[PDB]
Amino acid sequence: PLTLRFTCLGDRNVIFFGPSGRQDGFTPLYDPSPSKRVATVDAGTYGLFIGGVGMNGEFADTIIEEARRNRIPLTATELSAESQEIQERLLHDAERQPGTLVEIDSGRFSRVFARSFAYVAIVPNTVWDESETGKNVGATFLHILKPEVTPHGNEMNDVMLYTVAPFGNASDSAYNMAYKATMLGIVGAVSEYNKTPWGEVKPVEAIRLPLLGAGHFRGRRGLHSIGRANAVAVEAAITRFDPRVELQFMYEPSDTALRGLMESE
Ligand SMILES: Nc1ncnc2c1ncn2[C@@H]1O[C@H](COP(=O)(O)OP(=O)(O)OC[C@H]2O[C@@H](O)[C@H](O)[C@@H]2O)[C@@H](O)[C@H]1O
């Protein structure tokens, strides 16, 4: 865990994982024995469902394995549908009221989610043209996981986030604006959540971020430009909310989450 204090983030300690004992080197979504409640961010898709491949595929696999371990019938198709319907409705309310943490008690009708939230810092398809970025970009959700689907059966791994990153082929104008909107949403949701009663009890105290839009949403875009877009976004979000939480950046071979912020440094 490479810890570096960043002056442009107002003297905040940011973590940067190196490679791991994997063929891919990816950081694990959640730790086996964490000291903090770490909410990992799902690199979501336009369909707003949990599944598919990449990092979105990991979340599904992890949730389902833990579900089957606790002898809860949960298939990939059920998780995809149940998560899409929820995040579809929460998106509707979030867009009705930008900059406000909407909510539904998913626990009443869910084997997976105890409680689900959403937050939209900027209405999709206003500041940018979604024809360039894809739809529902910037949207962000926060789910509290029921104990039976909680990674490694650990009470602290009971929070996740889900966001949709801009497609790389978007204009630098549209891309950077979508990326900051995306980051404001993540930090905003956690900020606003920690102010809720559930936040007092189960406060998020760190955020595990992948390099958003650096996988299948990269297209023809260069990883440097993404490191910039990410660096600028974090600066604004930190300046916006002045958050107490700790940012953690997962590992990918190019290490551009760090290089970009070093440029911002
Ligand atoms: N299993 C994985 N675990 C951890 N990190 C991963 C994994 N696979 C890729 N990554 C890395 O996480 C970041 C995001 O990965 P992706 O989700 O593949 O890229 P993204 O453009 O954000 O998402 C595109 C597509 O992939 C699905 O996750 C999702 O359904 C979306 O449609 C990238 O930096 C990538 O290196």
Swiss-Prot record:
Its main location: membrane. Keywords: Membrane, Signal, Tachyzoite, Transmembrane, Transmembrane helix. It is a single-pass type I membrane protein. Residues 1-265 are cytoplasmic. One of its GO terms (cellular component) is symbiont-containing vacuole membrane. Interacts with host SAMM50. This is Mitochondrial association factor 1 form a1. The chain holds residues 162 to 426 of 435 of the full protein.
